[PDB]
Coordinates of C-alpha atoms and ligand atoms in Angstrom, one line a residue:
Chain A
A1 CA 0.0 0.0 0.0
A2 CA 1.4 3.5 0.9
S3 CA 4.3 1.6 2.4
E4 CA 6.7 3.5 0.1
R5 CA 5.2 6.9 1.1
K6 CA 5.5 5.6 4.7
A7 CA 9.2 4.9 4.1
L8 CA 9.8 8.2 2.3
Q9 CA 8.4 10.2 5.2
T10 CA 10.4 8.1 7.7
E11 CA 13.6 8.5 5.6
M12 CA 13.0 12.3 5.4
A13 CA 12.4 12.7 9.1
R14 CA 15.8 11.1 9.9
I15 CA 17.6 13.1 7.2
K16 CA 16.1 16.2 8.7
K17 CA 17.2 15.0 12.2
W18 CA 20.8 14.7 11.0
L19 CA 20.9 18.1 9.4
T20 CA 19.5 20.0 12.4
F21 CA 22.1 18.1 14.5
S22 CA 25.2 18.8 12.4
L23 CA 24.5 21.1 9.4
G24 CA 23.3 24.2 11.3
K25 CA 21.7 25.5 14.4
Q26 CA 18.0 25.4 15.0
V27 CA 16.4 27.7 17.5
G28 CA 12.6 27.5 17.4
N29 CA 11.4 28.1 13.9
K30 CA 14.8 29.3 12.5
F31 CA 17.6 27.4 11.1
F32 CA 21.0 29.3 10.9
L33 CA 23.3 28.3 8.1
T34 CA 26.5 29.7 6.6
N35 CA 28.1 29.1 3.2
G36 CA 31.5 29.9 4.7
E37 CA 32.0 32.9 2.4
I38 CA 32.7 36.5 3.2
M39 CA 31.2 39.3 1.2
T40 CA 29.8 42.8 1.6
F41 CA 26.5 43.3 3.3
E42 CA 24.4 43.9 0.1
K43 CA 25.8 40.6 -1.3
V44 CA 24.8 38.6 1.8
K45 CA 21.3 40.2 1.6
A46 CA 21.0 39.1 -2.0
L47 CA 22.4 35.7 -1.2
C48 CA 20.0 34.8 1.7
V49 CA 17.1 36.2 -0.4
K50 CA 18.2 34.1 -3.3
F51 CA 17.6 31.1 -1.0
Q52 CA 14.2 32.1 0.4
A53 CA 16.1 32.9 3.6
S54 CA 17.0 36.1 5.4
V55 CA 20.2 37.4 7.0
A56 CA 20.6 36.0 10.5
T57 CA 19.1 38.4 13.0
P58 CA 19.4 37.2 16.6
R59 CA 16.2 38.2 18.5
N60 CA 17.3 36.9 21.8
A61 CA 20.3 35.4 23.7
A62 CA 19.5 31.8 22.5
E63 CA 19.6 32.8 18.9
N64 CA 22.7 35.0 19.4
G65 CA 24.5 32.1 21.1
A66 CA 23.4 29.8 18.3
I67 CA 24.9 32.0 15.6
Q68 CA 27.9 32.4 17.9
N69 CA 28.4 28.6 18.0
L70 CA 27.9 28.2 14.3
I71 CA 30.5 30.8 13.1
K72 CA 34.3 30.6 12.7
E73 CA 34.6 34.3 11.7
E74 CA 32.8 37.6 12.3
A75 CA 29.4 37.5 10.7
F76 CA 27.1 40.3 9.5
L77 CA 23.7 40.5 11.1
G78 CA 20.4 41.6 9.5
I79 CA 20.5 44.9 11.5
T80 CA 21.3 48.4 10.3
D81 CA 20.6 52.1 11.0
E82 CA 20.9 53.2 7.4
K83 CA 17.6 55.1 7.3
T84 CA 17.8 56.7 10.7
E85 CA 21.3 57.0 12.2
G86 CA 21.6 55.6 15.7
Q87 CA 18.2 53.8 15.4
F88 CA 19.2 50.2 14.7
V89 CA 16.5 48.0 13.2
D90 CA 15.4 44.7 11.5
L91 CA 15.5 44.1 7.8
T92 CA 11.7 44.4 8.2
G93 CA 11.9 47.8 9.9
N94 CA 11.2 46.4 13.4
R95 CA 13.1 47.9 16.3
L96 CA 15.3 45.7 18.4
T97 CA 14.3 44.3 21.8
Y98 CA 17.6 42.5 22.3
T99 CA 21.1 43.9 21.8
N100 CA 24.5 42.7 22.8
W101 CA 26.8 45.6 22.0
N102 CA 30.6 45.3 22.6
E103 CA 32.2 47.8 25.0
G104 CA 32.4 51.2 23.3
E105 CA 29.7 50.2 20.8
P106 CA 27.9 51.3 18.9
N107 CA 30.1 54.3 18.0
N108 CA 29.4 55.0 14.3
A109 CA 33.1 55.6 13.8
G110 CA 34.0 57.6 10.7
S111 CA 30.4 58.5 10.5
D112 CA 30.0 55.4 8.3
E113 CA 29.0 52.4 10.4
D114 CA 25.4 51.4 9.6
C115 CA 25.8 47.6 9.7
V116 CA 26.3 45.3 12.6
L117 CA 28.9 42.5 13.1
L118 CA 28.6 39.5 15.4
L119 CA 32.0 39.0 16.9
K120 CA 33.5 35.6 18.0
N121 CA 32.6 36.3 21.7
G122 CA 28.9 37.0 20.8
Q123 CA 29.3 40.8 21.3
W124 CA 28.4 43.2 18.5
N125 CA 30.2 46.1 16.8
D126 CA 28.8 48.5 14.2
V127 CA 30.9 48.3 11.1
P128 CA 30.8 49.8 7.5
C129 CA 28.3 48.0 5.3
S130 CA 31.0 47.9 2.6
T131 CA 33.3 45.6 4.5
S132 CA 33.4 41.9 3.7
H133 CA 32.3 39.4 6.4
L134 CA 30.8 36.0 6.8
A135 CA 27.4 35.3 5.3
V136 CA 24.8 33.8 7.7
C137 CA 21.2 33.2 6.8
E138 CA 18.3 32.1 8.9
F139 CA 16.0 29.7 7.1
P140 CA 12.4 29.0 8.0
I141 CA 12.2 25.5 9.6
Chain B
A1 CA 2.0 6.9 -12.7
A2 CA 4.2 6.5 -9.6
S3 CA 6.7 8.6 -11.5
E4 CA 6.8 11.1 -8.7
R5 CA 7.3 8.4 -6.1
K6 CA 10.1 7.1 -8.4
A7 CA 11.7 10.5 -8.5
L8 CA 11.3 11.1 -4.8
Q9 CA 13.1 7.8 -3.9
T10 CA 15.8 8.7 -6.5
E11 CA 16.2 12.2 -5.1
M12 CA 16.4 10.8 -1.5
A13 CA 19.0 8.2 -2.4
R14 CA 21.4 10.9 -3.8
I15 CA 20.8 13.2 -0.9
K16 CA 21.7 10.3 1.4
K17 CA 24.8 9.6 -0.7
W18 CA 26.0 13.2 -0.3
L19 CA 25.4 13.2 3.5
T20 CA 27.3 9.9 4.1
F21 CA 30.1 11.3 2.0
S22 CA 30.5 14.7 3.6
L23 CA 28.3 15.2 6.7
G24 CA 29.6 12.4 8.8
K25 CA 31.3 9.0 8.8
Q26 CA 29.5 5.8 8.1
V27 CA 30.9 2.5 9.4
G28 CA 28.5 -0.4 8.8
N29 CA 25.1 0.5 10.4
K30 CA 26.4 3.5 12.3
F31 CA 26.6 7.1 11.3
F32 CA 28.9 9.3 13.4
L33 CA 28.0 13.0 13.7
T34 CA 29.0 15.9 15.9
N35 CA 27.2 19.1 16.6
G36 CA 30.6 20.8 17.2
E37 CA 29.7 21.7 20.8
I38 CA 31.5 20.7 24.0
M39 CA 29.6 19.9 27.2
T40 CA 29.7 17.6 30.2
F41 CA 29.1 13.9 29.7
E42 CA 25.6 13.8 31.1
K43 CA 24.7 16.6 28.6
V44 CA 26.0 14.6 25.6
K45 CA 24.1 11.6 26.8
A46 CA 20.9 13.6 26.9
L47 CA 21.7 15.2 23.6
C48 CA 22.2 12.0 21.6
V49 CA 19.2 10.4 23.3
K50 CA 17.2 13.5 22.3
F51 CA 18.0 12.7 18.7
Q52 CA 17.3 8.9 18.9
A53 CA 21.0 8.4 18.7
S54 CA 23.6 7.2 21.3
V55 CA 27.0 8.6 22.3
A56 CA 29.7 7.4 19.9
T57 CA 31.2 4.1 21.1
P58 CA 33.9 2.7 18.9
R59 CA 33.6 -1.1 18.9
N60 CA 36.6 -1.7 16.6
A61 CA 39.5 0.1 15.0
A62 CA 37.5 1.1 11.9
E63 CA 34.9 2.9 14.1
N64 CA 37.6 4.4 16.3
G65 CA 39.4 5.7 13.2
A66 CA 36.1 7.0 11.8
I67 CA 35.4 9.0 14.9
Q68 CA 39.1 10.1 14.9
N69 CA 38.7 11.4 11.4
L70 CA 35.5 13.2 12.1
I71 CA 36.6 15.2 15.2
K72 CA 38.6 18.4 15.6
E73 CA 38.7 18.2 19.4
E74 CA 38.8 15.5 22.1
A75 CA 35.4 13.7 22.2
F76 CA 33.7 11.8 25.0
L77 CA 32.9 8.2 24.2
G78 CA 29.9 6.1 25.4
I79 CA 32.1 4.2 27.9
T80 CA 32.4 4.5 31.7
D81 CA 33.3 2.6 34.9
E82 CA 30.8 4.5 37.0
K83 CA 29.2 1.4 38.5
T84 CA 32.2 -0.8 38.9
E85 CA 35.5 1.1 39.1
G86 CA 38.1 -0.2 36.7
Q87 CA 35.5 -2.2 34.8
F88 CA 34.8 -0.1 31.7
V89 CA 31.6 -0.7 29.9
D90 CA 29.1 0.2 27.2
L91 CA 26.1 2.5 27.8
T92 CA 24.1 -0.8 27.6
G93 CA 26.3 -2.5 30.2
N94 CA 28.3 -4.6 27.7
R95 CA 32.0 -5.1 28.4
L96 CA 34.5 -3.9 25.8
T97 CA 36.2 -6.2 23.3
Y98 CA 38.3 -3.4 21.8
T99 CA 40.2 -0.7 23.7
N100 CA 42.8 1.9 22.6
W101 CA 44.2 3.3 25.8
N102 CA 46.9 6.0 25.8
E103 CA 50.2 5.2 27.5
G104 CA 49.7 5.4 31.3
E105 CA 45.9 5.0 30.9
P106 CA 43.6 4.2 32.4
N107 CA 44.8 5.6 35.7
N108 CA 41.7 6.9 37.4
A109 CA 43.7 9.9 38.6
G110 CA 42.2 11.8 41.5
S111 CA 40.0 8.8 42.1
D112 CA 37.5 10.5 39.8
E113 CA 37.9 9.4 36.2
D114 CA 34.9 7.4 35.1
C115 CA 34.5 8.7 31.6
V116 CA 36.6 8.1 28.5
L117 CA 38.0 10.6 26.1
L118 CA 39.0 10.0 22.5
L119 CA 42.1 12.0 21.8
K120 CA 43.2 13.5 18.5
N121 CA 45.6 10.6 17.8
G122 CA 42.8 8.0 18.4
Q123 CA 44.2 6.9 21.8
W124 CA 42.0 7.1 24.9
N125 CA 42.3 8.7 28.3
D126 CA 39.9 8.3 31.2
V127 CA 38.7 11.7 32.4
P128 CA 36.3 13.1 34.9
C129 CA 32.7 12.9 33.6
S130 CA 32.2 16.5 34.8
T131 CA 34.6 17.9 32.2
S132 CA 33.3 19.5 29.0
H133 CA 34.3 17.8 25.7
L134 CA 33.0 17.4 22.1
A135 CA 29.7 15.7 21.6
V136 CA 29.6 12.9 19.1
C137 CA 26.6 10.6 18.5
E138 CA 26.3 7.5 16.5
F139 CA 23.0 7.4 14.6
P140 CA 21.4 4.2 13.2
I141 CA 21.8 4.1 9.4
Chain C
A1 CA -5.3 13.5 -1.9
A2 CA -1.6 13.6 -3.0
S3 CA -1.2 16.1 -0.2
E4 CA 1.6 13.9 1.3
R5 CA 3.4 13.7 -2.1
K6 CA 3.0 17.4 -2.3
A7 CA 4.6 17.9 1.2
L8 CA 7.3 15.3 0.4
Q9 CA 8.4 17.2 -2.7
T10 CA 8.3 20.5 -0.8
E11 CA 10.3 19.1 2.1
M12 CA 12.9 17.7 -0.3
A13 CA 13.2 21.0 -2.2
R14 CA 14.1 22.8 1.0
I15 CA 16.5 20.1 2.2
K16 CA 18.2 20.4 -1.2
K17 CA 18.3 24.1 -0.8
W18 CA 20.1 23.8 2.6
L19 CA 22.6 21.4 1.3
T20 CA 23.6 23.4 -1.8
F21 CA 24.0 26.4 0.5
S22 CA 26.2 24.9 3.2
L23 CA 27.2 21.3 2.4
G24 CA 29.1 22.0 -0.8
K25 CA 29.5 24.2 -3.8
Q26 CA 27.2 24.1 -6.8
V27 CA 28.4 25.5 -10.1
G28 CA 25.9 24.6 -12.9
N29 CA 25.3 20.9 -13.0
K30 CA 28.2 20.0 -10.6
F31 CA 28.2 19.7 -6.9
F32 CA 31.7 19.8 -5.3
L33 CA 32.0 17.9 -2.0
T34 CA 34.9 16.7 0.2
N35 CA 35.0 14.0 2.8
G36 CA 37.9 15.8 4.5
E37 CA 40.3 12.9 4.0
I38 CA 43.7 12.8 2.3
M39 CA 44.8 9.8 0.3
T40 CA 46.7 8.9 -2.9
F41 CA 45.2 9.7 -6.3
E42 CA 44.2 6.2 -7.1
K43 CA 42.2 6.1 -3.8
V44 CA 40.4 9.3 -4.5
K45 CA 39.5 8.0 -8.0
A46 CA 38.1 4.9 -6.5
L47 CA 36.3 6.9 -3.8
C48 CA 34.4 9.3 -6.1
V49 CA 33.6 6.4 -8.4
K50 CA 32.3 4.5 -5.4
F51 CA 29.8 7.3 -5.0
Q52 CA 28.7 7.7 -8.6
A53 CA 30.8 10.9 -8.7
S54 CA 34.1 11.8 -10.3
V55 CA 37.2 13.6 -9.0
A56 CA 36.7 17.3 -9.1
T57 CA 37.9 18.8 -12.4
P58 CA 37.6 22.5 -12.7
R59 CA 36.7 23.4 -16.3
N60 CA 36.6 27.1 -15.8
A61 CA 37.5 29.9 -13.3
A62 CA 34.1 29.6 -11.6
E63 CA 34.5 26.0 -10.9
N64 CA 38.2 26.4 -9.8
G65 CA 37.1 29.2 -7.4
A66 CA 34.3 27.0 -6.1
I67 CA 36.7 24.2 -5.3
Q68 CA 39.1 26.7 -3.9
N69 CA 36.4 28.1 -1.6
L70 CA 35.4 24.6 -0.4
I71 CA 38.9 23.2 0.5
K72 CA 41.0 23.6 3.6
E73 CA 44.0 21.7 2.2
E74 CA 45.5 21.1 -1.2
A75 CA 43.2 18.8 -3.3
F76 CA 44.0 16.5 -6.2
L77 CA 42.2 17.3 -9.4
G78 CA 40.9 14.9 -12.0
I79 CA 43.7 15.8 -14.4
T80 CA 46.9 13.9 -15.3
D81 CA 49.5 13.4 -18.1
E82 CA 50.1 9.7 -17.3
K83 CA 49.6 8.4 -20.8
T84 CA 51.3 11.3 -22.7
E85 CA 53.9 13.2 -20.7
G86 CA 53.3 16.9 -20.8
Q87 CA 49.8 16.5 -22.3
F88 CA 47.5 17.1 -19.4
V89 CA 44.0 15.7 -19.7
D90 CA 40.6 14.9 -18.3
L91 CA 39.7 11.6 -16.6
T92 CA 37.7 11.1 -19.9
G93 CA 40.7 11.8 -22.1
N94 CA 39.5 15.3 -23.0
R95 CA 42.2 18.0 -23.3
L96 CA 42.0 21.1 -21.1
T97 CA 40.6 24.4 -22.2
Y98 CA 41.3 26.1 -18.9
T99 CA 44.4 25.9 -16.8
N100 CA 45.7 27.8 -13.8
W101 CA 49.3 26.7 -13.3
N102 CA 51.4 28.1 -10.5
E103 CA 54.6 30.0 -11.4
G104 CA 57.2 27.5 -12.6
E105 CA 54.6 24.8 -13.2
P106 CA 54.1 22.4 -14.6
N107 CA 57.7 21.2 -14.3
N108 CA 57.4 17.4 -14.0
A109 CA 60.1 17.5 -11.3
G110 CA 61.9 14.2 -10.6
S111 CA 60.4 13.0 -13.9
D112 CA 57.5 11.7 -11.8
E113 CA 54.7 14.3 -11.6
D114 CA 51.6 13.2 -13.5
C115 CA 48.9 14.4 -11.2
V116 CA 47.7 17.9 -10.5
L117 CA 47.1 19.6 -7.2
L118 CA 44.9 22.6 -6.5
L119 CA 46.6 24.8 -4.1
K120 CA 45.0 27.1 -1.5
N121 CA 45.4 30.1 -3.7
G122 CA 43.7 28.4 -6.6
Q123 CA 46.9 27.9 -8.6
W124 CA 48.0 24.4 -9.7
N125 CA 51.1 22.4 -9.3
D126 CA 51.9 19.0 -10.8
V127 CA 52.7 16.5 -8.1
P128 CA 53.5 12.7 -7.9
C129 CA 50.3 10.7 -8.0
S130 CA 51.6 8.6 -5.1
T131 CA 51.3 11.6 -2.7
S132 CA 48.3 11.9 -0.2
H133 CA 46.1 14.9 -0.7
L134 CA 42.5 16.0 0.0
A135 CA 39.7 14.1 -1.8
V136 CA 37.2 16.2 -3.7
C137 CA 34.4 14.8 -5.9
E138 CA 32.0 16.5 -8.3
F139 CA 28.6 15.0 -8.1
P140 CA 26.0 15.4 -10.8
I141 CA 23.3 17.8 -9.6
Ligands
CA201 CA1 24.4 56.3 8.8
CA202 CA1 34.5 43.1 25.1
CA203 CA1 25.3 54.3 12.0
CA204 CA1 31.9 50.6 15.8
CA205 CA1 34.7 5.5 39.9
CA206 CA1 50.8 8.4 23.3
CA207 CA1 37.3 5.2 37.1
CA208 CA1 43.4 9.3 33.1
CA209 CA1 54.9 10.9 -16.8
CA210 CA1 52.3 31.9 -7.0
CA211 CA1 54.2 14.6 -16.0
CA212 CA1 55.6 20.5 -10.1

């Protein structure tokens, strides 16, 4: 009967189990993944979008730690103050409820730091959007 | 007809081929995987269990080498002598038929070394279960 | 109705999306993957073949860069001049249209360099086939 379909769904459920265990980090309904490539902010934006994903945007400590665990280099976050200087916000325009700025940040040094960078210790630093950093996308899971 | 089902099974077989090639190490009916996180023994136990897997327990040189190849840091094994000091055993209570102790091991230093650690060279060292080391689970494949 | 089949195909399409994003590098109809193990050329050949894949053979800059991005160590390419010294060719006998030799290469040093090695900077160097290097296979995607 639908024995095949039964086996397909069972096979899929385990493949998905493996992936969430070792391919990336799952926190709720988000799945953080990196292609291991560094590029400018606009590029990462296009990239994630190209995959039906969005740039990783930690909305709480758990997510921040998850991204922290995943990365081997500083990664751009889906946060900027491009439109209103000093007012950091989501790629959807939503203001942040959780922040983890590094000491002395944000400082908008050189009057040109509108992007945010997740550092290896989990802290953040505002950096120029034109710099090249690790691409990380959150996929809906 | 069942052309779709045909394609689904073919698609699944190749996805599985990719995963066994680059996601982890397959040795017989075991699939070794790591989430790249270090934690205490009890945590790793819970973790693997949480994924229908068990802590990696090499039962022969091939498996030991496979785990060795997979890891980038010392990993806990599913072996302990908690119940009977000096008598190392499986998470199922089965005694070991294969061991790869490091020189001078096991020594049960500090009278508190009931867990086993796979070192980068494949050799083993008994360590305190309360230490934090890389999590590795063997999944049924 | 075929709601399941619908869901299976949707589930598969996203699993495939994740894999092409983080498991390997896709360039056209090729999917480059590495098992992270170093071995002699003949071994890598057998390995890829064993997986219905072939040794990675960059046929253009995009592919070369893709392989370059993927690797953490020097990787053998599916190119040799075993049959006709100096005449480098595909594993299918096809002559190369794209090459990226390193300065001073190829030199066939020691009169025993019939294999090709992709270096970390993307350049190539002819090396003895008996040396052990990273295995990389291109899978049909
Ligand atoms: Ca600004
Ligand atoms: Ca600090
Ligand atoms: Ca700013
Ligand atoms: Ca700054
Ligand atoms: Ca004891
Ligand atoms: Ca030793
Ligand atoms: Ca002990
Ligand atoms: Ca010891
Ligand atoms: Ca020759
Ligand atoms: Ca050079
Ligand atoms: Ca030669
Ligand atoms: Ca040479």
